[PDB]
Structures are given as structure tokens and as C-alpha cells.
Amino acid sequence: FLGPAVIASIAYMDPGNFATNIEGGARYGYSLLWVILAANLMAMVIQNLSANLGIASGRNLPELIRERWPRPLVWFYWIQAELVAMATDLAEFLGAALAIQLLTGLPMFWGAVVTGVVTFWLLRGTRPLELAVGAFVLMIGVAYLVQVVLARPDLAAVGAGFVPRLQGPGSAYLAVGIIGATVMPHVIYLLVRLNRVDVIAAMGLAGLINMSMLAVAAATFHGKNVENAGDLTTAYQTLTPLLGPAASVLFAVALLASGLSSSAVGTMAGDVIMQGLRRLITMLPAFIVILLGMDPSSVLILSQVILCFGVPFALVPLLLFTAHHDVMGALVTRRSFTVIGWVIAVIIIALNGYLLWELLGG
Amino acid sequence: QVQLTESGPGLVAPSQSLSITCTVSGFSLTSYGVHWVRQPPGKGLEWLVVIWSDGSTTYNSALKSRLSISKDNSKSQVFLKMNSLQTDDTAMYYCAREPPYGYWGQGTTLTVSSAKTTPPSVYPLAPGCTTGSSVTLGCLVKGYFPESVTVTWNSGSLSSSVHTFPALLQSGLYTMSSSVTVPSSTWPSQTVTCSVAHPASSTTVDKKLEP
Amino acid sequence: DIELTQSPATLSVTPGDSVSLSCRASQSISNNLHWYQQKSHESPRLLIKYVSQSSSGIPSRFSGSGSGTDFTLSINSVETEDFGMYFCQQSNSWPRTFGGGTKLEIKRADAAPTVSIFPPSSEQLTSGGASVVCFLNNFYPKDINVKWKIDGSERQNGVLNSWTDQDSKDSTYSMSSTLTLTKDEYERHNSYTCEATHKTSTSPIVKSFNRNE
Ligand SMILES: [Os+3]
Ligand SMILES: [Os+3]
Ligand SMILES: [Os+3]
């Protein structure tokens, strides 16, 4: 429909889901559709739990974690959430700088200056711009739906998306990166039945978009052993079979628009979680990381990995408020929803501690 | 200097087992997926299989459920393995992968037949009564195994021209023809003999060619 | 399941005239191709990644030209180090598929075979075998139709042909055609005619021998 499609294109609209989904296509091919599916499946549950808690308690999670918790724990949780928003803005700025160097060839620091003046221009109105960004992201989604029809190994795609298996540090690392990019703390911190159905259908169609992106990054070059896998400059140059000369600039414009939109979205979310200036303190790490002399191709995925590092500090407080009687009243969430959410909370920490043990080994 | 090397050639009976080592150097094997290519001598070639690093084996429909590909990142080796060999699987194997498939191995030869080591049987080919001023004589080596053999012509003639045609497979063994040409004035005046050295059986037959 | 048919099968040319190989496809392959050169008993180095992006360390002689379902690799000013095998491979969809292959050979003026038919060997006669070998040496071009006639009746089976590589001396192909027989197949009949139909002669070059002599 017109509602859910635009809602999905706006709600995902980030360079993290773009970068982490192309890495998985050229490192483990179709064997990461399981990661994508599990990610969206738990993201919808987290969205529903967050909405239920926010409505039945009358406050967002930043306002709640200030009610009943020790002050040092509040400081530690603010450290965690501010590092989360910081990494989100870092990923935004990195994706935008890469898109700018792909479009006009400007170096990533001049691209950061351009993104700063675009943030200045965010404040010839908001009505005309909201259609353009959503239209660009919807067009790139249709472009990848154009390609998902050509993947010859249908049953191989199904079998690789069906059987979950991880092998070594790279597989678990990229899986954690993707599952932390999809399930975002923005989602965790986000006619009621209409809103619920719209969000569910939107996230479902956007999960289809992500599966299409991963399957295309797998079928375009998996065994071709092309020069680079996750270099979004090399990705953009070979991303697409169809409508070639315009496809490269289309991909670059889509990346730039998604980055500039996620900029405002995540920055306003950080302002919400912070007041209950802001743009510069969350921007400085982006500049110091892209100036340190390292290519952003791997840091754009490490940022999603760190967002997954930050997901449990936003997941543990949710269910404790969810399961309560003197607050939820007669509208307490079921015990089975609780059990499913807690199995998910155990699984995420299992994967993250797996990666951490593998890093401790060396 | 990046370089791939392979295992030594192999001669195995049918229904046996075999493995081939493709070792790499100069690049990071754990970061590139290796492809195999089978080429019989002159009989063309078709893409075989790909082992993406970390054990990801994908086989083609042509050669499936018979081949296997092991990997050993400790020594950065790719093992090809075959069971229950047949007659017409003899060929040279290649392993090749760096970024756009640039670097290939020198190739490993693999022959499968039940023939035991048998020294040859040289048959002289006398014209039996002579167009022009030059006459052609022949040697016919037949029924030997393995493949390698060298034919040298000893002739005191003031002129000659030797040819040696490639050995083909007849009924499991190998058959080969060899030519020589001499002036009619020095034949049978000056003897023109044909020696056939089969090193794998230590036998060399110095056959004299007479009418 | 997508295949690749390569044309021509074999190609003859002198140093100086540009050559062009075509690698026709089965369906649309979006500029996914690979050109390899090969020598006798060697490893094929990569020449052309996807199309006409001349690979690492490749001379500027070779150039690709690419479009959907039909790609062409052309060599301008063919130097002596360009002869041998050429192979074409697609890389879009499992399984990868190599083309029909080509063997670029050296070209020169025509020639005529010096046909010589031999009787079975004396030491081979008492061994049971009766091989009537018929040497066809120094002919051009390569394609010949050698034929055996046993008492007029043709012999399409039981024959065995072999061909040498392009001769190192003067680029002229020579071949051999043996006609193995048993005892009855050699004694029931009377004659053995070795004919060779060839381009350079409307009349096939013929040689023959007979048993009683
Ligand atoms: Os207060
Ligand atoms: Os409590
Ligand atoms: Os076959």
C-alpha cells in the first residue's frame, strides 16, 4: 500500500543496513538470509513490546530508567545510550561521506563539511523534501526487487536461508553487525491498531527489501572473487545489472539520501533520549574516525557491531517494566511474549559473547 | 611473487582412491575462493567446482556426489579427492584463484587404467617395392604402458627427416608410429635402424629395418 | 545450464593480420566473461576480465568487444607468441562454463601429402596383428579425409588416426592412419587401398599394395 511502503522506506533508510548487507553477500552469500530473517523477526517483537510499555506506563524508556535505578547505574546507562547514538551518527556521517565521494569525488572531510551545511539547511520546505528521500529509497528498493528475480539457485537460496549455521569469527561478526543494524535502539526507544498493523506490514516489506539486497549481493559476485566485497565504491560500480550508467549515480544518490535522512532521525532520537550542542558531540567521533587514515568500508560495519553491543542495555530494562501489575494494571503483557523476548535477549548476548571470546583468544 | 603449485602426477587403477594437493603462496588463501578446472589432453575443458575458503564446497551438476574438496588453512592447501575412478576420467587438473582468476597452477596429470607395466613390441615397416628419389621407412611401437617413450633413428645416410606421431590408446595399451626418410642410393646400402627406448620398463629395442 | 559456443574451432593466419574470436552465449550474460591464452602443456594466464579490461600484465595487442549474448576478442598485429589455445569462460551463474575453445595455428601456402602405404610387419604377422599403416606426411591444410578400401568395400571402423602438432620446421601437418586387423580380416580379403581426399587435388592421392607379390 501507500502507507506501509513509505513507512518502511523511511524507517530503514540508513547506510548501516546497506553496508552490512553487501558484506554478507560476498562473504557468506545466501547463508545470511537466516540472520536477516531472525533480525526482522525479533525487531517486530521488540517494536511491539516497546509500544505496549510506552502506552501502558505513560513514558519512554529514558524517562523510565530514571525512575527506579541507582544513580551510578543511570550514569553507566547514559554512557551506553550516548555511545549508541554516537555510533549511529558516526555511521550516518561515514555513509554520507562515502556517497559524496562517489557522487562528486570530494574527499570524505569535505563531504563531512557538506553534510554539516546540509544539517544547517535542515532548519523549499519540509513537505517537498519528505517525498524526495522516500521516493529515492523506494526506487532503489524497486531496483533490487528487479534483480532478485534473476537468482538461478532458488532452492539453494531457500536452503541457505533455512539452516542457521555460523563458522569462525567473520561469520558471527557480520551476523552480529547485521542483527544490530536492523534492530536499532531507535526502534527500541520509539488508530493504535492501525499504527501496529502499518508498522508490522512496513517492517515485513522492508525485510523483503533487505533479503533482496543480500541475495543480490550474493548472486552478483560471490565466486567471481572481485577486487573488493564491502568497498561501497566498488559496490556501487558493480552493484547492478540493469540501467547501468544511471544505476551507479542512482545508488550513490540513494545512499546519500538515506544517510541525510537517518541523520535527522537519529539526531532527534538522541535529543529525545538526551534531554530526558547535541549535534557536535555526537559528530566529533565521525570526523576523528574518518580522519584517522582508515577506509570507512569496515568501520561502517563495526559501527553496527557496536550498536549490537548497545542493544542489550536497551533490551533488559524493557521486559522488567513490561511484566508488572501495579503499573500495567489489568493490561499486563502475557507470559509467553515475555518468554519469547527473553529467549531473544539470551541469544543476542550468546552471539555477542561468542564474538568477544573469539577476540579474547586472538 | 604470488605462486600456486600442485601435487605430482598420478597413475592409479580403476575403483581406487586419490587426492591432489594444491598449495598456495604469495596471497591469503583464507581470503580467496579456489576454483578447479579439468582439461583432458586436447579434449577441451569445463568448469569443475569451487571451494570458497572455510570449507564452502559447491560442486557442478556434471561432477557431483563423486568428488570432494578438503581444505587445510594450517599449510594453506586445497585437497581434491576422488573415489571409484573410471576409465575416461584421465586428465590434467588445475586450481586457480586470485582476484580475477589470474593465477593458475602448473597442472597435475592423472591417468587411470588397469594396465601393468609392459615393455613395447617394435614392428618394422618395410616398403615392399618407390616414388621419387627418396624412400620412407617406418617403425611401429605397440602395446606398451606407461606413456613415455623415445624413438631415435640411427642412419648413416647423407640425408634424413624423422617424424614421431603422438601415441594413442589402443585397447588399453598405447600404439605409436614413427617415420624416417632416406635417399634410395644409401638404402639398403647404408643401414637405417630404429631404436625405441621405453624407460619405465628399462627396455630399449634397437630394431633393424630390412626388406 | 548456460553454455558457450566458440567460433571458429581452429584459426590459421600469418603474423600481421588481425584475428577475431567470437564466444556466443546461450542467454544474456551481462558482460561476465574471461579470455585465456594457453600453450602446449602449460597453464593458461588470464587475459581479459569482464570485457576488454585487459588483465594485469597483458600486452596491448588483445582487445575485447562486449555486448549481450555475443562477445569478440580481437588480436591486432599477431606476433609469433600468440599462437595456441584460447578459452572463453562466463562467471555469472552457477555453473561457470568454458567456451568451445580455439587453436590459433600458423598459415602458409598449400602442400600435398607424400603418401606411403606399408604392409604389416613380418614380426607382427606371426604375432597375429596385421597393421597396414599409411603415412601421410607434409600436407596442408590440416583437414584431410583418409580412407581405407578393403576389396573396394570401405573401412570406416577399425582405422586409427593420429596427427602431429604444426611441424617446427616448415609449419606443415603430417598424420598417420593405422588399419589394425585380425587373421581372418586380413586373409579373407585381397587388397588394401589407402586414399586421401584433400583440398589441393580434386583427385584423391592414392597408394596401394597387394598380398601376393
Ligand atoms: Os525530577
Ligand atoms: Os522491578
Ligand atoms: Os566428461
Side-chain angles (χ1 to χ4, degrees), chain C residues 101-152:
Chain C
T102 312
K103 188 159 181 54
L104 183 68
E105 57 192 26
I106 318 179
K107 196 179 82 174
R108 59 170 300 271
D110 287 18
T114 307
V115 183
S116 70
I117 178 181
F118 292 163
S121 306
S122 183
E123 294 80 355
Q124 185 189 174
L125 283 179
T126 189
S127 172
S131 60
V132 184
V133 187
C134 180
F135 293 90
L136 318 178
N137 294 16
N138 295 332
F139 57 82
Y140 194 96
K142 219 175 184 181
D143 296 338
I144 310 267
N145 193 334
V146 64
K147 211 58 181 184
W148 283 108
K149 287 183 174 176
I150 288 190
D151 294 357

Side-chain angles (χ1 to χ4, degrees), chain A residues 12-58 60-67 69-70 72-92 95-101 103-105 107-120 122-123 125-126 128 130-161 163-164 166-190 195 197-226 229-233 235 238 241 243-272 274-276 280-281 283-291 293-362:
Chain A
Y12 281 50
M13 211 169 252
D14 62 335
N17 282 271
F18 279 0
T20 59
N21 262 332
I22 285 187
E23 305 276 2
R27 290 300 175 180
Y28 302 94
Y30 291 87
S31 296
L32 231 55
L33 296 173
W34 155 68
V35 174
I36 286 292
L37 164 67
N40 264 113
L41 179 62
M42 55 159 295
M44 298 196 306
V45 173
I46 285 178
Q47 183 67 270
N48 253 10
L49 263 67
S50 173
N52 263 16
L53 174 60
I55 296 184
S57 293
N60 54 52
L61 195 45
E63 296 284 352
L64 286 176
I65 60 186
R66 194 66 170 90
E67 186 77 7
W69 274 114
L73 186 137
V74 171
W75 266 293
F76 308 150
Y77 268 71
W78 197 64
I79 288 180
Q80 298 153 355
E82 200 60 31
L83 279 182
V84 160
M86 194 178 303
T88 298
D89 280 329
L90 153 67
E92 167 267 335
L98 267 176
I100 288 183
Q101 189 168 341
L103 275 174
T104 182
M108 296 160 185
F109 49 93
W110 267 307
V113 177
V114 172
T115 59
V117 310
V118 165
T119 302
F120 168 84
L122 290 176
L123 188 145
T126 58
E130 181 69 14
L131 201 156
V133 192
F136 289 148
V137 173
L138 174 70
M139 184 158 50
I140 207 66
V142 175
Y144 280 10
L145 295 183
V146 162
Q147 299 152 348
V148 84
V149 77
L150 306 179
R152 175 207 178 277
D154 297 335
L155 293 181
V158 160
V163 169
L166 289 184
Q167 46 278 349
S171 68
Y173 169 87
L174 213 47
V176 160
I178 291 194
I179 202 175
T182 60
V183 180
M184 47 196 183
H186 180 46
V187 157
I188 313 177
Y189 294 150
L190 187 77
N195 168 271
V197 177
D198 294 356
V199 168
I200 292 182
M203 279 183 171
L205 201 144
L208 263 69
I209 294 290
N210 290 337
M211 279 181 294
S212 169
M213 183 157 196
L214 176 61
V216 170
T220 315
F221 39 94
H222 185 10
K224 298 174 56 181
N225 295 20
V226 194
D231 183 1
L232 260 60
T233 73
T238 326
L243 312 200
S248 56
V249 181
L250 173 61
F251 183 91
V253 168
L255 179 61
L256 183 140
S258 64
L260 286 183
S261 177
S262 186
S263 179
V265 173
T267 303
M268 191 175 61
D271 299 355
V272 167
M274 182 158 30
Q275 206 176 7
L280 285 73
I281 54 183
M283 173 268 309
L284 172 67
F287 214 88
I288 70 102
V289 162
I290 311 180
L291 184 57
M294 65 193 314
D295 298 338
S297 48
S298 176
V299 184
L300 194 45
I301 283 79
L302 177 59
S303 183
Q304 314 306 315
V305 177
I306 297 185
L307 294 178
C308 190
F309 273 66
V311 78
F313 304 131
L315 288 196
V316 176
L318 185 59
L319 187 75
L320 296 182
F321 286 89
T322 296
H324 192 87
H325 286 285
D326 204 7
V327 170
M328 311 279 288
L331 302 180
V332 192
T333 314
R334 300 184 196 173
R335 52 187 184 267
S336 307
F337 229 9
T338 281
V339 168
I340 269 66
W342 244 208
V343 174
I344 296 304
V346 170
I347 291 175
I348 303 174
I349 288 306
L351 286 193
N352 192 212
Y354 190 10
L355 178 62
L356 284 185
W357 161 71
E358 184 65 21
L359 178 58
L360 291 174

